[PDB]
Symmetry: C2
Subunit: 104 residues, 2 copies
């Protein structure tokens, strides 16, 4: 029913595969829930910058989304910008972060 | 094409129209950056909560997106949750905020 935990490893392999299939992507940054970049189509220095910082922004995002009332929990935090896109999906074990071009 | 636009205010009418055409939406909250809900398919108390708070979260989002390095500026801040989806598009003068059901 509700998203707590699944057969993670298979779901991750599926989704990671799918993240590779979504064309327009420039740099996949798949990190553990603490910001550990397991796979990366983006530079290591760059992943180090984004993974830890974005995690902390996510922590805040959790705080503001919940600040209203414990109605909403963060399922996707997808930020789109001019140069590139930064899609961050909070998972309970992972974070599917993908830097893509400004294509939906 | 960034200094020369086709329209400006007509763009809002277009986009607002289009925001109504995206089936799955529950509450459109279109606000000025001033924090003024001009149109709303959402309850006034609820829009008051989200409009001002989210604006301040956006201020922070601007800070953190720029904290990395001035490489991008916030074009879309779209948050998807369990209860609902909260899509926030930073505009020149507006913020296109739309509470929708987060369709997979």
């Amino acid at each position: 029913g509700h998203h707590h935990h699944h057969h993670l490893e298979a779901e991750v392999e599926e989704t990671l595969k799918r993240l590779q299939s979504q064309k327009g992507v420039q740099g996949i940054i798949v990190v553990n829930t603490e910001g550990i970049p397991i796979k990366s189509t983006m530079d290591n220095p760059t992943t180090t910058q984004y993974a830890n910082l974005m995690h902390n922004f996510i922590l805040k995002a959790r705080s503001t989304v919940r600040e209203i009332d414990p109605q909403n929990d963060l399922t996707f935090l997808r930020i789109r910008s001019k140069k590139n896109e930064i899609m961050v999906a909070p998972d309970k074990d992972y974070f599917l972060i993908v830097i893509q071009n400004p294509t939906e």
